RNA sequence: AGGCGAAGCGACGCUCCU
RNA sequence: GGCGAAGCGACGCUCC
């Protein structure tokens, strides 16, 4: 099946990012944007804005643009590329025509030169790009973009002519990269010192002011009563963020090895609550989640957020949003369904408290599902078990034993595939922010997956 | 003066509590009693409420109804009666007192006891029935003959007097009223200990009750209730309303963080460390050396894991806050927190925790915060365990020497120093009681001249 | 000459249509 | 009869 072997071909960089995935990449892309197109546009918006990729999606658009689906179907490219290029997509695409080696399309000259005199100042400096080899001067010089007006000309020709344009295109960069900043530009430009992160404040918003609380606090500003207000009163409105609960608990951890008050704990506390990931998944559902202490290990250097609590809290606002049963397996299935009572925080913290040791799949999921028998339908498990040569068998025999009972395994070191199920076992094949999603378009199936992808993510 | 005398004698079994002091206390008494019983009247007025002691009050009474007073001035025994019998149980004091001395029992202290215990609650006169102690609530019915005007009172007379013998009806009145209206311990008691009893203990507990009851609440995971939450977050928003003293506070927040409890109630803690001010009268510039000695880390009591120097640095934390001044530490380097104020007081008390524990060195501390700075204030409060020494303060001495209306004002937590006059200008209160503060402003006019600050602030009923 | 399409190195020129 | 006092539910005694 074509369509689901594009699919995994296309989404594992996600968590991943002549040749051989190469080659597949240009045969399958080409063949495909012959025949099902619209297939290929759903993929495309899929991997760009849900599973998150910025490479292969404008890729797929540069070989749509490559096919008679140009000329048929050229307002689905138009869809395809307003649902990819999220900036410096553009720069991207041009950035694969050039490393595989394709002609630039007369087409592709005029959408590269739409897209280059429509993009906004701010995004064409912060993302000018001048270190790379395919840079906007590259782009310049190759499409050769019309300026519409005397200020996008400047701007032009500060992009070719370095510090050695004209001092009137010096000045015109200098100020709109010094207009209308971010706090990290305001922090920059006036420096590091308490009355500038004061006068950042307002602009600290979401996950940029969860990360700036350390510094916060390290100037001393939590203790000032009109911070702790404006904290507060931003806190209300945490729970509408687009913030995965692994910030939540590394801003946590974060301040309780600094020592902050206990007010902005309790708010993130409450804030790490909420943090609840959608998804269509309905139903009873048992989650032998990985907390072991092998699992745990770093996301970041910056981030002391620590694997296993990332997936634990995952789980656990999982559990909490869905019901159902989360057995904590490292050695021993710890079933937490009775500790439902407590707050998802101090659930967390338990569970990072209790949950550590090696990594035993197998009786966990004889403990929890084959002699319990357990009634539900799902059983979501995240692991970074290595490849074994029978991996999951009395998971398939308690599944034969019933109807309408499937599997959805995650891979979070990348050892599968974004795999459709096979002996009604999907698997993910990754640690992504959005693995949630992932497993929701893997239930399906192969024989399904086109239909759900045209009806779900069809660019518009 | 005879009056210092009394006063230093009275005010200190707070930390204090034949024999050699009790024949003092018999002539004192005595003497006062005879000369200036007024003066009796407003010491025991307060000698109870402020810096409180069970054994002294109702002494001072026993002393003046034994003398000419009980005529000329009866209603001057009567405030010092009113003010001395707080509680339900010090009729049992009085008594014991009398028998103990070997006085004879006059017939107005027989009306005067007989006040103290006809007249008592049922419920305080049940709750300290004491028949374990020699002088029980029986052996004071054998003595006074009370007057039963009604039935009830001659049911409660029988049963302690019959114990388990007396009349079924004076029995089952011992098993209602021990039943109806009760405290937290009497409805667990009777109820069991299951989360509901506790649920419904938690509306009956307020206060002190409440914030020492915390830690058994979250044994049975009351704290993880949103509704048990609210209310909890309430009565202690309250905390510093209620004269809850700040080591209770923060012995109850050492034992939350270390079981770890939800930080509603543990940031409610820590910000009620921001104790109810200890009242004082010191006003101006102040300047606070507070002990953090290792060794004055003993704890306030055995079962509160909190230390004494957690007390005491809340103490001077809170008034240095309030008063202004000069906030330093001392055990071996004089810190001065007054640059750390931006912080919360927990966080106050806790860096005292961090940078506080060792040694005792308060020479160099008084040097470098008083002389050395030539700090301008006129009120230097060093709250401290230290030891006697050859020439404790004599830089403090030359200090107050150095100028006008300067006073020094020595707290020594063992007991081992009266309440008494500040010679060369230093007052010591020479105890550690919950409310040194109050015996520090009463030493601030001193002992030797106390008599006129008495009679002008504490008027006995 | 204008629009369209494409080839290559600023949009000129070239093919088709007008 | 009321008060005071002494001794042990209060009588009795002093004074009124």
Known sequence: SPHGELFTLVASSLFLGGGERVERFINLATTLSKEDPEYVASLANYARNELG??????????????????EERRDLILATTKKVWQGDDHLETLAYVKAVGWKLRSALKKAIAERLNDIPPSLLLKYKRARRVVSQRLAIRLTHPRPRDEERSLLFQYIVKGSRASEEAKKLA?????????????????????????????????????????????????????????????????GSWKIFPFQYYSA??????????????????????????????????????????????????????????????????????????????????????????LSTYSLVRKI???????????????????????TGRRVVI????????????????????????????????????????????????????????????????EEGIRNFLVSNYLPP
């Open 174 to 238: 200098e100020e709109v990269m010094e207009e209308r900043p971010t706090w990290e530009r305001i922090i920059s430009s006036k420096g590091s010192t308490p009355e500038t992160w004061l006068e950042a404040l307002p602009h600290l918003n979401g996950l940029s002011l969860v990360r700036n609380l350390n510094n916060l606090f390290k100037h001393g500003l939590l203790e000032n009563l009109e911070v702790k207000k404006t904290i507060e009163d931003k806190f209300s409105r945490s």
């Open 53 to 70: 990729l910025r490479s292969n999606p404008a890729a797929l658009v540069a070989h749509l643009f490559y096919s008679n689906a140009l």
């Open 382 to 445: 995240i692991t970074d078990e290595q490849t074994h040569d029978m991996p999951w068998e009395a998971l398939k025999d308690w599944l034969r034993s019933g109807e309408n009972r499937v599997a959805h395994i995650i891979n979070v070191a990348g050892y599968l595939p974004t795999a459709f199920p096979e002996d009604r076992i999907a698997k993910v094949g990754g640690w992504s922010d959005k693995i949630i999603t992932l497993i929701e378009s893997l239930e399906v199936g």
């Open 352 to 374: 990072v408290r209790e949950g550590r040791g090696g990594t035993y799949l197998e009786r966990a999921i004889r403990k929890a599902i084959l002699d319990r028998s357990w």
């Open 252 to 341: 946590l951890k974060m301040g309780e090895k600094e020592g902050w008050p206990y007010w902005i704990m309790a708010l993130l506390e409450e804030a790490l609550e909420s943090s609840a990931p959608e998804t269509r998944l309905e139903g009873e559902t048992l989650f032998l989640v990985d907390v072991s202490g092998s699992m745990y290990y770093p996301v970041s250097r910056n981030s002391n957020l620590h694997m296993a609590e990332a997936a634990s809290v995952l789980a656990t606002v999982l559990v909490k949003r869905l019901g159902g049963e989360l057995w904590t397996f490292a050695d021993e299935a710890q079933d937490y369904t009775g500790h439902t009572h």
